[PDB]
Ligand SMILES: c1ccc(-c2noc(C3CCC3)n2)nc1
Ligand SMILES: c1ccc(-c2noc(C3CCC3)n2)nc1
Ligand SMILES: [Ca+2]
C-alpha cells in the first residue's frame with residue numbers, strides 16, 4: 001500500500017512530464033501558425049499541468065521559459081497586462097527579461113530579436129499616446145546611436161515614425177517565428193506526439 | 205502543407221484524448237484517497253484539456269459525467285457553489301441530476317447512492333439553518349414513508365436528527381468511494397498510465 005501509492009505518484013509525475021512537453025510543443029506551433037485562440041486555450045492547459053508538477057528537469061524549465069516568453073510577446077500590445085509583481089513592467093519588458101535569462105546560444109538571431117523587442121517596447125507605448133510611460137520604459141531598458149534616436153522620437157512625440165516601420169512589430173514577430181521554427185523541429189519527437197502520429201499514420 | 209496541418213490536428217486530438225483519460229483516472233483516485241488538493245488541481249487540468257477538444261466518444265462523455273458528479277459531491281457542503289444556470293439548484297441536487305443521466309447499470313449500489321444523495325441534499329441545508337431552502341430542495345426532489353419522515357424533520361427544524369446520522373454524509377461518501385473503486389479498476393489500463401507505469405517499473 002505504501003509502496004503502491006509511491007509507484008502511482010511516480011507514474012503520474014512521468015505522465016505529467018509527457019503532457020507538459022506535448023503542450024509546450026503545441027503552444028509553439030500555434031504561435032508559429034498565428035492560431036491565436038488555440039494558443040490561448042493551450043496556454044491555459046499548460047499552466048494547469050504545471051501547477052500539478054513539483055519537479056522539473058533543466059530541459060523542462062527552459063521549455064517553460066520559452067512558453068512564458070511567447071505568452072508575453074502575444075500580449076505585447078496589451079499594456080493592461082501585468083506579468084510581474086512590479087506593476088510598471090510592460091509585457092514586452094517582461095519578454096526581454098526572460099529572453100536574456102533562457103540558457104540558449106546568443107547567436108545573431110538572438111541579438112536581433114532582443115533589439116526588435118527593445119524598440120517595440122517603446123513603440124507600443126507611443127502608439128497609445130502614453131509618452132511619459134515610453135520614457136520610463138526607455139530608462140529601464142537603455143540604462144549610443146540607437147539610444148539617442150529613440151529618445152529623440154519620444155521627446156518629439158513622433159508616434160508614427162519611419163524608424164518604427166523599419167524595425168516593426170511584424171518584423172519582430174517574423175524573426176520570433178523563425179526561432180520557434182527551430183524549437184518545433186527539436187520537440188516534434190516528444191513521446192506523446194510521436195505515439196499520436198503513429199496512431200494517425202496507421203489509419204491512412 | 206494542407207494535408208500536413210490536418211495530420212497534426214488529428215495527432216493533437218489523439219493526444220488530448222489520452223490526456224483526458226489519464227486526468228479523469230487521476231481525479232477518481234484522488235477522490236478515493238481523500239487527497240483534496242490533488243483533486244482540486246487535477247480538476248482544473250481536466251477542464252482546460254476539455255476546452256481544447258471538439259469530439260468526444262460515448263466512453264469519454266460518460267467519463268466526463270463521472271468527473272462532474274465527483275466535483276459536485278466534493279462541494280456538497282458548499283451551498284455558495286452554483287453549478288447550474290438555475291441559481292437555486294444546490295451542489296447535491298446537481299450531482300443527483302448527473303447520477304440519474306449517466307449510462308450505467310442501475311444496480312443496488314446505484315440506488316443506495318441516489319437515496320443517500322437525496323437525504324443529504326436536505327441535511328446540509330438544515331445543518332446551516334437554511335430551513336426554508338431545505339423545504340424547496342425537498343419539493344424539487346420528492347415530487348411515501350421516507351418522504352413524510354424528511355418533511356417532519358424539516359417542519360420540526362430538528363437539524364441534528366438521528367435519521368441524518370444513520371444515513372450520514374460519511375456513509376454517502378464511503379458508498380461513492382466503493383463505486384469509484386470499480387471505475388478505477390476499469391481505467392487503470394489507459395494508454396498514458398500504462399506507459400508511465402512501464403517506465404517506473406523499468407527503473408526498479
Ligand atoms: C505557459 C508556460 C508556463 C506557464 C507558467 N505558469 O506558471 C509557471 C511556473 C513558474 C515556474 C513554472 N509557468 N504559463 C504558461
Ligand atoms: C471535470 C470534468 C469535466 C469538466 C467539464 N467542464 O466542462 C465540461 C464540458 C461539458 C461538456 C464537457 N466538462 N470539468 C471538470
Ligand atoms: Ca499599463
Ligand SMILES: [Ca+2]
Nearest residue numbers: 283284285291
Ligand atoms: Ca446558496
